[PDB]
Design an enzyme around this catalytic site. Structure first.
Site, short mmCIF file in Angstrom:
data_model
loop_
_atom_site.label_atom_id
_atom_site.label_comp_id
_atom_site.label_asym_id
_atom_site.label_seq_id
_atom_site.Cartn_x
_atom_site.Cartn_y
_atom_site.Cartn_z
N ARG A 7 -0.95 -0.17 10.45
CA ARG A 7 -0.57 0.91 9.36
C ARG A 7 -1.09 1.30 7.74
O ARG A 7 -0.62 2.19 7.08
CB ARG A 7 0.72 -0.30 8.56
CG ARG A 7 1.24 -0.03 7.19
CD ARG A 7 1.99 -1.11 7.02
NE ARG A 7 2.39 -0.72 5.52
CZ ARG A 7 2.20 -1.18 4.16
NH1 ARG A 7 1.09 -1.60 4.20
NH2 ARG A 7 2.63 -1.16 2.79
N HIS A 12 -3.39 5.26 5.31
CA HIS A 12 -4.81 6.39 4.05
C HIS A 12 -5.61 6.38 4.80
O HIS A 12 -6.89 6.44 4.12
CB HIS A 12 -5.28 4.49 3.35
CG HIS A 12 -3.70 4.08 2.86
ND1 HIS A 12 -3.40 4.54 1.26
CD2 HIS A 12 -3.35 2.58 2.82
CE1 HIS A 12 -1.96 3.62 1.05
NE2 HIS A 12 -2.46 2.14 1.86
N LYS A 40 7.42 8.14 -1.38
CA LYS A 40 6.40 7.30 -2.49
C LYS A 40 5.47 7.91 -3.25
O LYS A 40 5.67 8.68 -3.27
CB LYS A 40 5.62 6.43 -1.11
CG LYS A 40 4.76 5.92 -1.77
CD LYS A 40 3.73 5.36 -0.51
CE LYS A 40 2.31 4.32 -1.54
NZ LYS A 40 1.74 3.73 0.34
N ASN A 43 -0.36 7.30 -3.11
CA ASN A 43 -1.32 6.88 -1.68
C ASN A 43 -2.25 8.08 -1.90
O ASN A 43 -2.42 9.10 -2.37
CB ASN A 43 -0.02 7.79 -1.20
CG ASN A 43 -0.58 7.52 0.15
OD1 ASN A 43 -0.98 5.74 0.50
ND2 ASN A 43 -1.39 7.88 1.36
N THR A 44 -3.32 7.26 -0.91
CA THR A 44 -4.60 7.72 -0.88
C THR A 44 -4.63 7.90 0.14
O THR A 44 -4.71 6.56 1.06
CB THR A 44 -5.84 6.37 -1.66
OG1 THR A 44 -5.03 5.95 -2.79
CG2 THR A 44 -7.05 6.70 -1.59
N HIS A 116 -5.29 -3.57 3.69
CA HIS A 116 -3.89 -2.90 2.49
C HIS A 116 -5.18 -2.08 1.85
O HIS A 116 -6.22 -2.72 1.23
CB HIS A 116 -3.77 -4.00 1.42
CG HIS A 116 -2.37 -4.77 2.34
ND1 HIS A 116 -2.43 -6.34 3.41
CD2 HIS A 116 -1.34 -4.69 2.21
CE1 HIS A 116 -1.66 -6.86 3.54
NE2 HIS A 116 -0.50 -5.82 2.92
#
Ligand SMILES: O=c1ccn([C@H]2C[C@H](O)[C@@H](COP(=O)(O)O)O2)c(=O)[nH]1
Length: 119
Positions: A7, A12, A40, A43-44, A116
């Site tokens: 994920r 990412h 969303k 996000n990076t 994460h």
């Protein structure tokens, strides 16, 4: 196991992109499944070799946002993508900011892998 790491890559990691413009965010935010049902907001995308990114897990522990101590810092090229607010699902729209910057990631497992995107 794999599923959280998978994920992390999906959300990412985009090693060979220069990125850094809105068409990129607009394209990649939908291709990478962060546009389903709702947009969303932030996000990076990290533009770095995956093994280089994994190498960040082996540096000294520092504190995560939520309190825990399994976070690590590195400096990497990214594209940060922020929703424009005119934007409305399912047609999500984003502004891109390109920079080289410090990121913080949480790692878990043996061997340690990113799980994460903290900061
Ligand atoms: O400076 C920041 C602060 C927050 N986030 C967002 C991006 C991630 O999508 C989210 C955490 O995602 P997880 O990997 O924790 O699900 O926090 C950033 O990207 N950069």
């Amino acid at each position: 196991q794999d599923r959280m790491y998978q994920r992390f890559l999906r959300q990412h990691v985009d090693p060979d992109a220069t990125g850094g413009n809105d068409a990129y965010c607009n394209l990649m935010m939908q291709r990478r499944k962060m546009t389903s049902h709702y947009c969303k907001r932030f996000n990076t995308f990290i533009h770095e070799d995956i093994w280089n990114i994994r190498s960040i897990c082996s540096t000294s522990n520092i504190q995560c946002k939520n309190g825990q101590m399994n976070c690590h810092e590195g400096v990497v090229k990214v594209t940060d993508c922020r929703e424009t607010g005119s934007s409305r699902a399912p047609n999500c729209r984003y502004r891109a900011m390109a920079s080289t910057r410090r990121v913080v990631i949480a790692c878990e497992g043996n061997p340690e892998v990113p799980v994460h995107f903290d900061k």
